[PDB]
Amino acid sequence: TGYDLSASTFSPDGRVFQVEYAMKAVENSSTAIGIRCKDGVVFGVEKLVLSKLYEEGSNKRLFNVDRHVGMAVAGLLADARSLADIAREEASNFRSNFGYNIPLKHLADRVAMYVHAYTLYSAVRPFGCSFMLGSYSVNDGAQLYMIDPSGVSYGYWGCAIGKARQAAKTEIEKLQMKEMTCRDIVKEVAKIIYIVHDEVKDKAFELELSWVGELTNGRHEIVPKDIREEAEKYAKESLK
Amino acid sequence: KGVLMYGPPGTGKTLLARACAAQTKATFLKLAGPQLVQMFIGDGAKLVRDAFALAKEKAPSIIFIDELDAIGTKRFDSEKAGDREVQRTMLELLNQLDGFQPNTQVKVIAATNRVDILDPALLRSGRLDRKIEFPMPNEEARARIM
Amino acid sequence: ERGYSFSLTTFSPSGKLVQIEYALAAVAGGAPSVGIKAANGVVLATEKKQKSILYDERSVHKVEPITKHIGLVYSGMGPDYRVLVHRARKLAQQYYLVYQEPIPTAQLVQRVASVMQEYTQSGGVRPFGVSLLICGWNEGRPYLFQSDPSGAYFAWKATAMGKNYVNGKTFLEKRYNEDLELEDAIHTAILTLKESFEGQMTEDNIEVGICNEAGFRRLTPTEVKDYLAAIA
Amino acid sequence: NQYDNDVTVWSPQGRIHQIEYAMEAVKQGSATVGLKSKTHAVLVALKRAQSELAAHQKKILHVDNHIGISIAGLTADARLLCNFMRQECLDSRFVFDRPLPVSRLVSLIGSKTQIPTQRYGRRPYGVGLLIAGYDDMGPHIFQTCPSANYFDCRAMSIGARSQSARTYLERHMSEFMECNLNELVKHGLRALRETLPAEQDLTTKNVSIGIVGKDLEFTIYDDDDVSPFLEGLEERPQ
Amino acid sequence: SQLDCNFLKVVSSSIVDKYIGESARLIREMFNYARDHQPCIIFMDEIDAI
Amino acid sequence: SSAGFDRHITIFSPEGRLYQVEYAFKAINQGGLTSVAVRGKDCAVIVTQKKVPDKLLDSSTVTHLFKITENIGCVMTGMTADSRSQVQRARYEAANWKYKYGYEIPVDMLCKRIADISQVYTQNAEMRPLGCCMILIGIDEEQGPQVYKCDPAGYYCGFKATAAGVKQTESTSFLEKKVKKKFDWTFEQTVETAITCLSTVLSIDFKPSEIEVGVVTVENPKFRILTEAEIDAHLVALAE
Amino acid sequence: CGKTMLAKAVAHHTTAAFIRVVGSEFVQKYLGEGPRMVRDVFRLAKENAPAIIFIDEIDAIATKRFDAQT
């Protein structure tokens, strides 16, 4: 051994294990999925009720970076909201210097170069978080990006991060996200995260949904209660 | 054909194998890992083909191998030194399991607790098919265990 | 970020700096190169073989000029060479902005070798893996100096660096005298590079640069073909 | 274990062991229990001592007129975050002339303690902050941990032998959102007699109570004024 | 499945035993069998043992 | 062949080697990718493949071809996180040439500045030396087209035909038999001889959805990326 | 490099007796066969002719390390 202690050393076959070890820490966080509809992006996070003593609305794994940009995280939660602070701060420097709202192909570029910068030195560790960025503009449409702890970003029609990643994105491609608007998506977002996480592992869990598009007039916010109650009404019909 | 269980050392691997020895009424046959290691040459190799010929005779039979990382350690190229006689017992265990003249009469249950040590020649798909892992008990299983 | 701020080059218990001894092993596995001064100018000749026919040989250069009258070749590893070239290009300018005079070739080697010694003691760095040959004609008389990764320097009449350098130095010892012209030293520099090259020594497998009192210059492959012709 | 030395090094399983060892430091300190009603936020601590003549180490501290905290772990890092806590409250009062909200205070702590959990040669802060306070939204109970992960909760308990206190809080938290200040406190006082050996419980010199209230500034009660609260508890059933 | 009489498959681990010269007696007496049956193929699987 | 920490950081072996760099050359090969660049008589062509394993992924955001300046394009191999960081430097260094010197940077001077930066990583014993490669093309006045490669060791050279990636040696053996018979090269022949390079090495015989081609020519010196429709025009003419 | 080949050409143009042994056949199973097998080669090289002994792969016989326990 000895070839895997620092992030400054390659292996004798040419790969870095400190990044791969931090990628393994993501699959112990639960599940965060997000797909984009024809005219907007819908996030979705199932939230484990660890004990009864916590309060409904605690420790949200679903942030709010800018007025139109949303973030759903998966990983070590202290590093999640630390990456959320620099992304919230990066968009403020764009509007102050250039005058207008930051686009997603630039925002996820500036954040991923900040994540990549900790995969080079021995003085710092790689982050233990993977997360998704989605938004809607009236001149660019809906956007959906995703960033690993190594620093690689791509566009997606729908993605999934958490424990059951392949077992979640198997059913995403059963949908048709090219033509559905962001109303019937909300019922289909919830349904594919009820079929995952058998009740042997967890007793009870919490649904948390997010929502952006021109139906929300460009601003990012949470779903209302009645709409996610319709999805929770559309929960127990997967037993047939 | 061929199952493999692995994981942390206290998760219960022998406990399934001792369970199956009580349930099915077949010819159960067990092995230690370092039992197939002999001072003279070719005796550990002879001892493998004698065991599978015995389980060939009792045609409903399953064979169990505990601590497979004793003999299934990864091969390596080196001059001046290095063990070789252990690989011969491994390379027949590759062949006498699977390859020329195959059979469907015996089933292999293998158990180790470290995987990265093992030779990829014995983890192919045909020799050890279903590689299941044993995770540590999460919360609820510990309430069931004690 | 920051650095390490500790020397990773220490004394052995036998009293030898081991990393400098290893850097001389990388110098000895480089391309062979010879350098000869003879009474009116210095000849620097090296050996440049592309690995395949796909490479553009007119793109990079082994023989580099430092100023109007100073050239410089190497025998070591590639990317370390271009660093201390750009360093030595700059050092010749700060001498010129103070004194309004082209730098003497001795004073350049005073300052290039001071960089290499400073770089084998400071914190968190491995030493260079190149040795140099520096020519030039200051005040009539020519000069030929050789540095090393340790930071020392010498004043050679004729020497060889690279692979089979111990055979070239025996060959030059039986060849060189005090009285040769520049075109004679060119002919014996090709005759000593033929000791270690392949079968075809064409106009683009080698690279030759000369000094005169007219200044340093580098030969085009036209007259290099004429020198390679009627050779050996 | 060579993966067990510095905060920078990841485990091959993906769990940084230096963070997990700072969780062992908060499990060494004595227990404390915080809980809230609709209109109040009460936290109760249990002191310890070294000899019978040395005094008892206090744990409840006063941050502001509407925020108080309770510590568990080594006391030197507790005062390091306490002097950061007081400073961030009175400058917001200096700039905006308003009480700084509680949920916005804790996110400053989570960004404060995450920084030494990523550099080289920097320990985490071993500390056990239970925070009680007032926003404009009523009472709030927050807990932190040396993994820089703060939790929103309605009743928690941390310290040595705290799992027994959590089981008491789960089977009585349906009653907490109705009662006044009197039996809200002695609901929490029945949790501290749960986490003790079966012979000594509450002898009026090792327990402290702090309340912030809807028209009540944050007030600490110590070893004489505890006695009105402490009377009115039944005997331990055996 | 093409020869059936003069095709020799060898596992390259049966050819070794703990006596003195019996390991090399087989390699002599395999190829002596090979010249006696002139159209013949020797197959030697997993030679890394020997 | 090893003594000390020469396997771990960038110091010298007893043989004169240094292993952390030659570990990093085979970090390029883990991408599972191969790119080909061919210089013509009046043009320069880069061809490379793209492998999209998902239907849920946006196929317009996986381009390894990048536009550095208005007249300079490049292709990136190796791992993605280090390659996109190195493009960000090359965009920055070209803009400072124009601001300091008042004219367009030559493509060999840009490759020198990238290789000088990459030299410093294998020169200090602290940083990890960026395991990804670099191939540039461009039109230069009184030089015509020209192609350059920069490796993570700090070496660079001008080529006439270039391969990089997993199948590098098999591609260059194909091209060196093609160039030494010395046929003249038009525009379309350099497009034909570059596609048939990685079509015979990789043995694919593909449809136009898996490769991407950038080009520059001295009638339109703008680096431009070909549409899939006009990729298909060269492809059906390649099958006579 | 023509080691076995040059011995073939010597045996073709000789006028002497040529004795050709493989140097891994002295390890017979029975004890004492080998030392009897060595000494009757040279006795056959004595009685027959001014002959030529050719032994190949002496590494099967002449090594460095031994073990007087096996």
Ligand SMILES: Nc1ncnc2c1ncn2[C@@H]1O[C@H](COP(=O)(O)OP(=O)(O)OP(=O)(O)O)[C@@H](O)[C@H]1O
């Ligand atoms: N003139 C030559 N010089 C060298 N080798 C030749 C020549 N002509 C043919 N060969 C080839 O060289 C091969 C090796 O012959 P030979 O067995 O004598 O080499 P060797 O050194 O004994 O190798 P080994 O010891 O491995 O058997 C022959 O099979 C032949 O094909």
Ligand SMILES: Nc1ncnc2c1ncn2[C@@H]1O[C@H](COP(=O)(O)OP(=O)(O)O)[C@@H](O)[C@H]1O
């Ligand atoms: N329900 C259970 N789950 C896991 N382990 C158990 C359970 N019940 C008992 N055990 C313990 O697990 C042990 C099995 O050992 P095991 O983990 O198979 O050893 P190894 O894997 O190192 O061969 C037994 O000693 C048994 O006491």
Ligand SMILES: [Mg+2]
């Ligand atoms: Mg066991």
Ligand SMILES: [Mg+2]
């Ligand atoms: Mg031979």
